[PDB]
From a paper:
The structures of RlmJ bound with GA* or GA*A were refined to 2.3 Å and 1.6 Å, respectively. In the RlmJ/GA* structure, the ASAM moiety is superimposable with the RlmJ-bound conformation of SAH, Asub (corresponding to A2030 in the E. coli 23S rRNA) is bound in the presumed substrate binding site, and the neighbouring guanosine (corresponding to G2029 in the E. coli 23S rRNA) binds in a pocket on the surface of RlmJ next to the catalytic site. The N6-atom of Asub is positioned, through the alkyl chain of the linker, at 3.0 Å away from the carbon corresponding to the Cϵ-atom of the methionine moiety in the SAM cofactor. Such a distance, in two non-linked moieties, would allow for an SN2 methyl transfer to the N6-atom. Asub of GA* is involved in an intricate network of interactions with strictly conserved residues of RlmJ that reveals the RlmJ active site. Asub is indeed π-stacked between the aromatic residues, H9 and W195, and is stabilised by hydrogen bonds from its N1- and N3-atoms to the side chains of the K18 and N12 residues, respectively. D164 forms a hydrogen bond of 2.7 Å to ASAM and we propose that a hydrogen bond between D164 and the N6-atom of A2030 would form in the case of the non-alkylated RNA substrate. Y167 also—along with residues V199, Y173 and P197—provides a hydrophobic surface near the catalytic pocket where the guanosine is positioned. Interestingly, H9 swaps conformation from solvent exposed in the RlmJ/CA structure, to buried in the RlmJ/GA* structure, from where it can π-stack with Asub.
We previously designed adenosine-SAM bisubstrate analogues that contain the SAM cofactor with the S-atom replaced by a N-atom directly linked to an adenosine at the point of nucleophilic attack to mimic the substrate/cofactor bound state. These molecules were used to study the substrate recognition of the m6A MTase RlmJ, the Ribosomal RNA large subunit methyltransferase J that N6-methylates the adenine A2030 of the E. coli 23S rRNA. m6A RNA methyltransferases (MTases) catalyze the transfer of the methyl group from the cofactor S-adenosyl-L-methionine (SAM) to the N6-atom of adenines at specific positions in RNA, releasing the cofactor product S-adenosyl-l-homocysteine (SAH). Two crystal structures of RlmJ in complex with RNA–SAM conjugates were solved and revealed the RNA-specific recognition elements used by RlmJ to clamp the RNA substrate in its active site.
Author numbering: 2 to 53, 58 to 280
The structure:
Amino acid sequence: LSYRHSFHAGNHADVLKHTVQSLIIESLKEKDKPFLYLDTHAGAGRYQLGSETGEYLEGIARIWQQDDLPAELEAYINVVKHFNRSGQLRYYPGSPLIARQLLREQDSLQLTELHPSDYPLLRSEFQKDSRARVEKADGFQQLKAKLPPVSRRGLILIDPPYEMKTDYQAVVSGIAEGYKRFATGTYALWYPVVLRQQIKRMIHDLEATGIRKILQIELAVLPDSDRRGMTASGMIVINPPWKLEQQMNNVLPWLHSKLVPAGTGHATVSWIVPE
Ligand SMILES: *CCCN(CC[C@H](N)C(=O)O)C[C@H]1O[C@@H](n2cnc3c(N)ncnc32)[C@H](O)[C@@H]1O
């Protein structure tokens, strides 16, 4: 009955990933046929901002009230505003609540979350929502057990914490088990850039699966470093919607200028593997 807190909720990485998620869902909704949203590392659902302040102040805060807000970011900010109708950031949606509000009545959610402290809160967020299934299990295995969805259209969101290095391996081995079973779905992998070499290994191991039509979006606050920590984050999208890349070239520059006012880092949208 008590919402979780999160120092990082709504930080620049969140803004990027929930932007890409929201754009992919809205592209899915263009056909009035149903689709699944599979979230492997779902977290609690929402996060009470502050204490009794937080990295949201340098993230969702810098963009959600901006008069010139790009039109592609509207569906995302409208979710944040639904969870903050006082006009003050006191809550930040998680990807499952992003999904809850954007998905239609006919659509389906599959959510997994192993930690005993969030699973209860998450389960309550869909307590009354039959579209979803919430389980306290390992989400990399839901790629083998939940796919393909009956609808045969969907978005898988793999957003691991990278607390153990083996998560840099797990996500690529998991995407291959997902892709064997459901090769037409859009997979979306978040990464933090702490040590680029780590990321470059991941990406090499991902093209080595042989999956094609792979895109890469990355928002860096600082040029790559080792003394700093998370100098960037990005999204690697497999089978993206065709407008995602022109949507992320139209948006990500603006995003970088608002989230990173001190003019450091970069904002890149590239193709890891062409079609
Ligand atoms: C950067 C990832 C932070 N978090 C999820 C954030 C949430 N999706 C959002 O979009 O706001 C990671 C959560 O994943 C849990 N977790 C860790 N390991 C697993 C596995 N193997 N399966 C499911 N869930 C996992 C953590 O407890 C975090 O709550």
